[PDB]
Design a protein around this ligand. Sequence first.
Ligand code: ZN
Length: 258
Amino acid sequence: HHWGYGKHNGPEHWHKDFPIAKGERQSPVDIDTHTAKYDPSLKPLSVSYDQATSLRILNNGHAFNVEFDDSQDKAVLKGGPLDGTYRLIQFHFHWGSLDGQGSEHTVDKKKYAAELHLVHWNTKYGDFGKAVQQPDGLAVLGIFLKVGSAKPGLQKVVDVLDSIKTKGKSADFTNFDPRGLLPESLDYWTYPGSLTTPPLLECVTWIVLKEPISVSSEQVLKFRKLNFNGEGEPEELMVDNWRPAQPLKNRQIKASFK
Ligand SMILES: [Zn+2]
């Protein structure tokens, strides 16, 4: 009986195996747009993904990750509230069983159909494993997805899901350009938080974009066809793999815009 999102191993049970679940800087949180502070000292984000090298896509049992080669500064995030260079290692999504839920972060209590997380780690720490043990170890770019028009840049991802239907399956996934997943504007909210899945370490600097991207009902429907289970085990659709909002606990959310 390990963690999951079902009735018996869901987010509400995680604190038993991971006490930090009830910690002081847990994520996600609800972003109250009228309480967030405009901080003009925040620089614009600098996303250099031109030399990104995707390597494979994997179904790990709780979501699907697209992994990148992070052995060099090929795809990096700088600027904003960050000190130093953060390398992109993987990206994944959080989605629901219905279009009205799925995102982890909420804006004025509004839930989106899904949320994309682009995970980066601070290079001063040498590797992802060391970075997660530091308060400024990770930088995660969060992007909301709403249902409407199709996103062409996401179709390549949608088309291969069939080959990694169950837990443990992986497939080569080269030459995917993550720049096709970015919205027009890079305005954002930022606050110090944690990973939203166990081990739930409080090593993340969250950068949540104001502008969501649109995907079609057909694209999100294919996400819902994935399984939490491994091949040959009873089928459990991979849906609602999101953690609900946690207490802000006197943290302050800053906005790069007004
Ligand atoms: Zn995530």
